[PDB]
Amino acid sequence: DPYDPFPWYEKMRKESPVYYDEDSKVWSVFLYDDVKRVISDKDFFSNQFPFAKTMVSMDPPKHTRIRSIVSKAFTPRIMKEWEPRIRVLTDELLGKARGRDEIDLVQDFSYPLPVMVISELLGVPSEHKEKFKEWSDLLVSLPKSAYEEDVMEWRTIRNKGEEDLSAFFENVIEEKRRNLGDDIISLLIQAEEDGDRLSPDELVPFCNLLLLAGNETTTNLISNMVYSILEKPGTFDELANQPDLIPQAVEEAVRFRAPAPMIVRFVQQDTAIRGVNLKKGEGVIAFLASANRDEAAFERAHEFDIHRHPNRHIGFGHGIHFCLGAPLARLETKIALEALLKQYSAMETISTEPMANSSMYGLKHFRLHVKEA
């Protein structure tokens, strides 16, 4: 089963916490404390690997400047300003599924929602929604094979998709400068740090980064959360009788079934983890999914506990690169679960089809039997 790689994570935590793959010459780390240090110890583990124009591949001070500016678009105040809009979009998705006793949580809910949400939060007119989805699908696409002929064909089509989306965002930015609104692009136009503003050359890639970093991740979080709730008899009912536990259930879902299993860093200075020496220039794969299942870090790490509070997981990362969109992912996932708990008195898993992507843990299909309340 590709939806159950936890037994392997456990084998690697106890027999090879610090693993070196001779075929790829890249390190692997699986224990919570070591995964946490690799992703946060910036002085020794770097994000620069010579995505390229974005802060995800930057180290301080270049990262610090951009991070300090774009963070003004994800403040708690701004999130509350947008909570109503996310609820409307979620209600509209579920409304399209009224009068059915079987739905596919992915294709009918968890996959569409993030793309719809980020377009309305970015200020993209809703009248381009279907051409916005195509570009966003192209952005997160992967080649079917690793041979030159297949990657070359895929790269050329995503390149043209990224260029058209870039030109599309450049037009939205230009329009918002004259008619500013209540959206991310408008906020970043007027966002300023002692006179320092994001350039057009920086805003456009950043808006592509929001689609690339937020769409599938949030989709997988919602699907994995609903799956884990229905995996434990009584949790669905328990959440509907104590709705204030939903945020804690969202965090537990990021710990239990991390949508982004692994994070990459490059060794910046010679150092050692757990006694294993690592040379400058080597790649380290930090397995967040395994860190969040570490029994040395969490009590009953193999069980889904919606009462765990506070949750010290690192599914959103840790350090200066801590997920910029975590406030939005948390709010979106909370609202999605509330909308399901209110529309359905009961849900039952019929069949699941997991996503077999390396750098993503989620489901491509999640067919359910539902009962409207």
Report in angstroms how near the CB of residue 145 gets to ligand HEM at its nearest. 26
Q: Which stretch binds ligand HEM (CB under 6 A): 162-170, 212-220, 236-244, 354-362?
A: 212-220
41 is in an annotated binding site: no
Q: Smaller CB distance to ligand HEM: residue 273 or 285? A: 285
* Cα–Cα distance for residue pair 58/90, rounded to 1 Å: 34
Q: Is 47 annotated as a binding residue?
A: yes
By CB under 6 A, which span of 7-15, 29-37, 134-142, 319-327 interacts with ligand HEM?
Answer: 319-327
In the window 343-362, what residues touch ligand HEM (CB under 6 A)? Answer: none
Total of residues contacting ligand HEM (CB under 6 A): 26
Residue numbers 148-207 binding ligand HEM by CB under 6 A: none
- Using CB under 6 A as the binding rule, whether residue 301 contacts ligand HEM is answered as no
Q: Does 321 bind ligand HEM (CB under 6 A)?
A: yes
CA pair distance 16, 283, nearest whole angstrom: 17
- What the block records as the tokens of 21 is 């793959």
- CA distances to 104, 117, 241, 266 from 82, rounded to whole Å, are 27, 10, 26, 36
Stretch that binds ligand HEM, among 123-131, 252-260, 272-280, 341-349 (CB under 6 A): 252-260
Contact residue for ligand HEM among 112, 205, 315, 354 (CB under 6 A): 315
CB of 220 to ligand HEM, least distance (A): 7
Nearest-angstrom CA–CA distance, 265 and 285: 7
Binding mask 3-42 for ligand HEM (x = CB under 6 A): ------------------------------------x---
Contact with ligand HEM (CB under 6 A): which of 69, 210, 240, 297? Answer: 210
Determine, following the binding rule CB under 6 A, whether residue 116 of this chain makes contact with ligand HEM: no
28, 186, 218, 228: residue in contact with ligand HEM (rule CB under 6 A): 218
Nearest to 261 by CA among 1, 9, 40: 9
Residue 278: both structure tokens together: 């690592």
174 burial level (CB within 10 Å; 0-12, 13-18, 19+)? exposed
- Residue 331 touches ligand HEM, criterion: CB under 6 A: no
Task: Tell me which residue has its CB nearest to ligand HEM.
Answer: 325
CB of 134 to ligand HEM, least distance (A): 19
Taking residues 61 to 100 in sequence order and writing x for each that binds ligand HEM by CB under 6 A, - otherwise, the string is ------x---------------------------------
Annotated binding site for heme b: 47, 63, 67, 265, 321, 323
Annotated binding site: 47, 57, 63, 67, 192, 195-196, 265, 321, 323
Please report, as ranges, the residues that interact with ligand HEM according to CB under 6 A. 39, 47, 55-56, 67, 118, 209-210, 213-214, 217-218, 221, 254, 259-260, 263, 315-317, 321, 323-325, 328-329
